[PDB]
Design a protein around this motif. Structure first.
Motif, PDB file in Angstrom:
ATOM      1  N   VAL A 137       0.891  -1.209   0.188  1.00 27.48           N
ATOM      2  CA  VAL A 137      -0.067  -0.037   0.079  1.00 27.48           C
ATOM      3  C   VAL A 137       0.983   1.232  -0.142  1.00 27.48           C
ATOM      4  N   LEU A 138       0.318   2.265  -0.512  1.00 26.60           N
ATOM      5  CA  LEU A 138       0.962   3.567  -0.723  1.00 26.60           C
ATOM      6  C   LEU A 138      -0.008   4.764   0.056  1.00 26.60           C
ATOM      7  N   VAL A 139       0.497   5.785   0.762  1.00 28.81           N
ATOM      8  CA  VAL A 139      -0.102   6.692   1.404  1.00 28.81           C
ATOM      9  C   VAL A 139       0.196   8.047   0.608  1.00 28.81           C
ATOM     10  N   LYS A 140      -0.680   8.939   0.659  1.00 27.61           N
ATOM     11  CA  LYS A 140      -0.348  10.181   0.070  1.00 27.61           C
ATOM     12  C   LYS A 140      -0.944  11.550   1.103  1.00 27.61           C
ATOM     13  N   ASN A 141      -0.459  12.588   0.662  1.00 27.81           N
ATOM     14  CA  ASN A 141      -0.828  13.791   1.328  1.00 27.81           C
ATOM     15  C   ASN A 141       0.300  14.117   2.489  1.00 27.81           C
ATOM     16  N   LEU A 142       0.279  13.440   3.488  1.00 28.40           N
ATOM     17  CA  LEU A 142       1.114  13.307   4.629  1.00 28.40           C
ATOM     18  C   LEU A 142       1.470  14.531   5.047  1.00 28.40           C
ATOM     19  N   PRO A 143       0.634  15.238   5.996  1.00 30.58           N
ATOM     20  CA  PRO A 143       1.000  16.435   6.378  1.00 30.58           C
ATOM     21  C   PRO A 143       2.175  16.264   7.596  1.00 30.58           C
ATOM     22  N   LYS A 144       2.684  17.443   8.118  1.00 27.06           N
ATOM     23  CA  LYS A 144       3.465  17.205   9.395  1.00 27.06           C
ATOM     24  C   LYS A 144       2.628  16.460  10.430  1.00 27.06           C
ATOM     25  N   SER A 145       1.540  16.796  10.514  1.00 25.32           N
ATOM     26  CA  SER A 145       0.875  15.773  11.610  1.00 25.32           C
ATOM     27  C   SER A 145       0.815  14.502  11.449  1.00 25.32           C
ATOM     28  N   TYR A 146       1.361  13.941  10.449  1.00 25.00           N
ATOM     29  CA  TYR A 146       1.472  12.609  10.061  1.00 25.00           C
ATOM     30  C   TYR A 146       2.764  12.210   9.643  1.00 25.00           C
ATOM     31  N   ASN A 147       3.937  12.597  10.570  1.00 31.97           N
ATOM     32  CA  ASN A 147       5.260  12.414  10.396  1.00 31.97           C
ATOM     33  C   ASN A 147       5.463  10.818  10.749  1.00 31.97           C
ATOM     34  N   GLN A 148       6.634  10.217  10.671  1.00 35.59           N
ATOM     35  CA  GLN A 148       7.107   9.152  10.403  1.00 35.59           C
ATOM     36  C   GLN A 148       6.481   8.335  11.985  1.00 35.59           C
ATOM     37  N   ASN A 149       6.842   9.145  12.869  1.00 39.58           N
ATOM     38  CA  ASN A 149       6.535   8.672  14.565  1.00 39.58           C
ATOM     39  C   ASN A 149       4.933   8.411  14.450  1.00 39.58           C
ATOM     40  N   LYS A 150       4.141   9.340  14.072  1.00 34.47           N
ATOM     41  CA  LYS A 150       2.842   9.136  14.099  1.00 34.47           C
ATOM     42  C   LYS A 150       2.378   7.971  13.066  1.00 34.47           C
ATOM     43  N   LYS A 155       2.564   4.676  14.638  1.00 34.30           N
ATOM     44  CA  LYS A 155       1.544   4.507  15.666  1.00 34.30           C
ATOM     45  C   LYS A 155       0.340   3.827  14.882  1.00 34.30           C
ATOM     46  N   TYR A 156      -0.047   4.376  13.694  1.00 33.00           N
ATOM     47  CA  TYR A 156      -0.948   3.886  12.768  1.00 33.00           C
ATOM     48  C   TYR A 156      -0.642   2.393  12.308  1.00 33.00           C
ATOM     49  N   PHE A 157       0.378   2.265  11.396  1.00 34.04           N
ATOM     50  CA  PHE A 157       0.360   0.943  10.553  1.00 34.04           C
ATOM     51  C   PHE A 157       0.499  -0.319  11.656  1.00 34.04           C
ATOM     52  N   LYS A 158       1.086  -0.238  12.959  1.00 34.54           N
ATOM     53  CA  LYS A 158       1.160  -1.242  13.777  1.00 34.54           C
ATOM     54  C   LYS A 158      -0.309  -1.513  14.433  1.00 34.54           C
ATOM     55  N   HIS A 159      -0.960  -0.387  14.456  1.00 41.95           N
ATOM     56  CA  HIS A 159      -2.634  -0.714  14.934  1.00 41.95           C
ATOM     57  C   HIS A 159      -3.393  -1.033  13.652  1.00 41.95           C
ATOM     58  N   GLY A 203      -2.170  -3.585  11.054  1.00 40.97           N
ATOM     59  CA  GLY A 203      -1.900  -5.205  10.949  1.00 40.97           C
ATOM     60  C   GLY A 203      -0.598  -5.372  11.204  1.00 40.97           C
ATOM     61  N   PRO A 204       0.022  -6.879  10.968  1.00 38.94           N
ATOM     62  CA  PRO A 204       1.312  -7.306  10.827  1.00 38.94           C
ATOM     63  C   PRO A 204       1.936  -6.668   9.506  1.00 38.94           C
ATOM     64  N   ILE A 205       3.102  -6.312   9.646  1.00 36.39           N
ATOM     65  CA  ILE A 205       3.936  -5.659   8.397  1.00 36.39           C
ATOM     66  C   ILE A 205       5.379  -6.374   8.474  1.00 36.39           C
ATOM     67  N   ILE A 206       5.884  -6.390   7.121  1.00 34.37           N
ATOM     68  CA  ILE A 206       7.336  -6.571   6.820  1.00 34.37           C
ATOM     69  C   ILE A 206       7.991  -5.283   6.887  1.00 34.37           C
ATOM     70  N   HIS A 207       7.802  -4.413   5.870  1.00 36.09           N
ATOM     71  CA  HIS A 207       8.525  -3.126   5.870  1.00 36.09           C
ATOM     72  C   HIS A 207       7.521  -1.893   5.867  1.00 36.09           C
ATOM     73  N   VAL A 208       8.117  -0.701   6.152  1.00 39.01           N
ATOM     74  CA  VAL A 208       7.271   0.552   6.247  1.00 39.01           C
ATOM     75  C   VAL A 208       8.428   1.727   5.832  1.00 39.01           C
ATOM     76  N   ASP A 209       7.960   2.400   5.054  1.00 38.61           N
ATOM     77  CA  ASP A 209       8.785   3.948   5.143  1.00 38.61           C
ATOM     78  C   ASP A 209       8.037   5.260   4.856  1.00 38.61           C
ATOM     79  N   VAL A 210       8.441   6.299   4.713  1.00 34.29           N
ATOM     80  CA  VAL A 210       7.837   7.379   4.155  1.00 34.29           C
ATOM     81  C   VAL A 210       8.861   8.020   3.085  1.00 34.29           C
ATOM     82  N   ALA A 211       8.091   8.923   2.329  1.00 36.11           N
ATOM     83  CA  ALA A 211       8.707   9.537   1.185  1.00 36.11           C
ATOM     84  C   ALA A 211       8.348  11.038   1.247  1.00 36.11           C
ATOM     85  N   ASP A 212       9.618  11.779   1.941  1.00 37.82           N
ATOM     86  CA  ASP A 212       9.825  13.096   1.855  1.00 37.82           C
ATOM     87  C   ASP A 212      10.163  13.660   0.392  1.00 37.82           C
ATOM     88  N   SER A 213       9.206  14.001  -0.241  1.00 39.95           N
ATOM     89  CA  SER A 213       9.446  14.660  -1.837  1.00 39.95           C
ATOM     90  C   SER A 213       9.345  16.141  -1.768  1.00 39.95           C
TER      91      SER A 213
END
Length: 161
Positions: free
Chosen positions: A7-20, A23-27, A29-39
């Motif tokens: 899956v891919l996420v878009k928009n990503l405010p300051k309010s949904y920084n990596q830390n934030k 919190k959401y992805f681990k709540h 499901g189970p996951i292998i890998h996760v990253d963000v893209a600062d564009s």
């Protein structure tokens, strides 16, 4: 052959920084890998998550309908904008890819290496770019580049769907 495990996420405010986001992805499901893209070249950010499951994807996609500080984030399946190399040597270090994508594109979304055993695993590697229009040209070049008599092989599509 046809699953959306990624899956891919878009928009990503300051309010949904990596830390934030973490919190959401681990709540979700189970996951292998996760990253963000600062564009930095664009207003909106992106992110990418390898849940490795179909139920994983649904748990992410459904989680989209929660606004976060005036920038409603968009969760969906991943699109074909992932390059991946197959026929390539392990000396492609993650740094090297960030150079090479700046050299042909300028900007990337994210960069995954394999980790099987140690290094000598001859697995494949997977890199995401916003730059997909020029990536359609780059593929064509690299799909028949020569290195040490090996024809390199890359693709720009999603190797499970």
């Amino acid at each position: 052959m046809r699953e959306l495990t990624t899956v891919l996420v878009k928009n990503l405010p300051k309010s949904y920084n990596q830390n934030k986001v973490y919190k959401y992805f681990k709540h979700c499901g189970p996951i292998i890998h996760v990253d963000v893209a600062d564009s930095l070249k664009k207003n909106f950010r992106f992110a990418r998550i390898e849940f490795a499951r179909y139920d994983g994807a649904l748990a992410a996609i459904t989680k989209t309908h929660k606004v976060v500080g005036q920038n409603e984030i968009i969760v969906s399946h991943l699109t074909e904008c992932t390059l991946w190399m197959t026929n390539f040597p392990p000396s492609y270090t993650q740094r090297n890819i960030r150079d090479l994508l700046q050299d042909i594109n300028v900007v990337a979304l994210s960069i995954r290496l394999p980790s099987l055993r140690f290094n000598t695993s001859r697995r494949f590697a997977y890199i995401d770019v916003t730059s997909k229009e020029d990536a359609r040209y780059c593929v064509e070049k690299l799909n028949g580049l020569k290195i040490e008599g090996y024809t390199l092989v890359t693709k720009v599509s999603n190797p499970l769907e």
